[PDB]
């Protein structure tokens, strides 16, 4: 029905709108005041523009793809888009794990913060990411290794209009293990002891002078990535273990769940004074 076709574009449009204008700001500020070139900034940096090749790429050709239902594109050009979706979603989830580590590593050693984080030490870490990212995403699909061997996805590969995703059992396995699971345990392990230690600053502070703010932060933090992806990446697995007990259509709207958090990235960590006046003196 017309209706359908154009109030879900409505939505599909908002969305990119909302996560190109939120992911431009904060480079924006980043770039131009030097208020704010912290060696902390660079991780945020790197985060923002993973977003922005996700709000740029991943989202519009694939709500035209879904509204239109045939991929009228070459049957080479959508491979690259799969490739870009696999890279910006690792890069932006190890991005988080990278930022976590770095908050850990400040707060239980105070005295050798400044002298084992460092502006050369912050570029390595970027680019390993990143590198780890890019060989998980463009060499194992565009060599064609994660191809499945079942009748309909080969009578599926070998049309150009066909674009659905069709992958082996170790991919959907390994792919899956290097992506979320072990930055998820490394976040937990990480924002436990954060956790404690403010427990015991507290405690240590009343007793001389004689916490919401703890558990309302960390909640924030950590309930927007364990609700936005895990839904996913438990029926990413799911579906190859076990027959075909996971429908198609599921698969899909779990999968653009995941696409929104890029969205909230600037609202959960851009919220400090310092960012909120340099997004005051840029607008207005
Ligand atoms: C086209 N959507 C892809 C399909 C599979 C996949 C995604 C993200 C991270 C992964 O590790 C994956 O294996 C999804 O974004």
Known sequence: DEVWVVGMGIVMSLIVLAIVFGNVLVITAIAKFERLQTVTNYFITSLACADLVMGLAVVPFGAAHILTKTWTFGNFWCEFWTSIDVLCVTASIETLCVIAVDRYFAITSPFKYQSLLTKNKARVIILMVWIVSGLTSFLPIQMHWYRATHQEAINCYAEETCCDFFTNQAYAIASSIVSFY????????????????????????????????????????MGTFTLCWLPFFIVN???????????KEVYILLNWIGYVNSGFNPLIYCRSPDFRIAFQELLC
Do not use: C, W
């Not at 930055?183 to 002078?209: C, G, N, T, W």
């Not at 697995?237 to 429908?247: E, G, K, T």
């Open 182 to 221: 072990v930055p998820l345990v490394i976040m937990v392990f990480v924002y436990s002891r954060v956790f404690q230690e403010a427990k015991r600053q507290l405690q240590k502070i009343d007793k001389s002078e004689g916490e919401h703010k703890a558990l309302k932060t960390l909640g924030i933090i």
């Open 237 to 247: 697995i799911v579906h190859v273990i076990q027959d075909n007990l996971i429908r």
